[PDB]
Write a protein that binds this DNA or RNA. Structure first.
Ligand SMILES: [Zn+2]
Length: 253
DNA sequence: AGGTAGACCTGGAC
DNA sequence: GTCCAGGTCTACC
């Protein structure tokens, strides 16, 4: 899921698990557990901790327990559900946290691409994968100044810049293409070639793009061959930053 | 060795 | 048997 849907999961999951105490952890695909590397230590350390909170950083969910934080990335098709220990697990269930009240937090993932890392709370932010993660796009910490500073410094295309997780959190292929379209900037342009006016406009559209989605219709992403919604020009697709890239050659410059 | 490009977690679909 | 999905932390220099 994208950032806005991860925020929805964060908001919806929290009341279903807050205040519950872990009694067991069952792991059916150890490779999902990335820290501690030994999934046995992962399972053992969580036992007896109570869920106190659930936060989001970029696309990462951060489950706050007593001593530890569990940092979870759903990647492609990871999903969490809360259900009774008495019911059969659903297909592709790879990790299960059993609570003392007979309920369970289940993690399902067809591709097995998701990741889990557990650290002491006070360490989580300075260890992978959260270490280096850029500012939240909806936060004052993500500013035109910050964006301009990174743009003027690189030889990369603007798209490559915006896909860099250290620049800003939670921007992937879709929102990058959409933001660039709304700002009227071609994705293949050198980041350093953007005028201050363009940086300001891109910042504004980046914020509106994720902002409208987190609170609540694509212009270019996956619409190649179809008419642009603003000028009717056919949307085109190329490779930029080694990625499938969608844009309107008339609206964007 | 800082900045960058892009390698890699797998099952499902071709 | 081959290829795709893809964000991001690795690894290349
Ligand atoms: Zn257009």
């Amino acid at each position: 899921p994208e950032l806005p849907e991860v925020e929805t999961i964060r908001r919806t999951l929290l009341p279903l698990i807050v205040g519950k105490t872990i009694e067991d952890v069952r792991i059916f695909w150890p490779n999902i557990i990335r820290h501690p590397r030994d999934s046995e230590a992962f399972a053992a350390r969580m036992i007896g901790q109570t869920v106190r909170g659930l936060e989001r950083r970029g696309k990462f969910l951060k489950f706050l327990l007593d001593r530890d934080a569990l940092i979870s990335h759903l990647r492609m098709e990871g999903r969490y559900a809360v259900a009774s220990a008495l019911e059969p697990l659903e297909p592709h269930t790879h990790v299960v946290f059993c609570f003392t009240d007979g309920s369970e937090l289940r993690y399902r993932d067809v591709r097995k691409f998701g990741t889990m890392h557990v650290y002491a709370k006070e360490e989580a932010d300075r260890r992978p994968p959260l270490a280096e993660l850029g500012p939240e796009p909806l936060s004052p910490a993500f500013s035109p100044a910050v964006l301009a500073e990174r743009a003027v410094k690189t030889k990369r295309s603007v798209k490559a810049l915006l896909l860099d997780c250290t620049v800003v959190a939670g921007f992937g292929n879709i929102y990058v293409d959409e933001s660039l379209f709304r700002a009227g900037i071609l994705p293949g342009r050198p980041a350093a070639s953007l005028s201050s006016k363009e940086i300001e406009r891109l910042h504004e559209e980046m914020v509106a793009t994720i902002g409208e989605a987190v609170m609540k219709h694509l212009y270019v992403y996956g619409r190649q061959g179809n008419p642009c919604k603003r000028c009717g020009t056919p949307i085109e697709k190329t490779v930029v930053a080694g990625r499938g890239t969608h844009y309107c050659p008339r609206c964007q410059r």
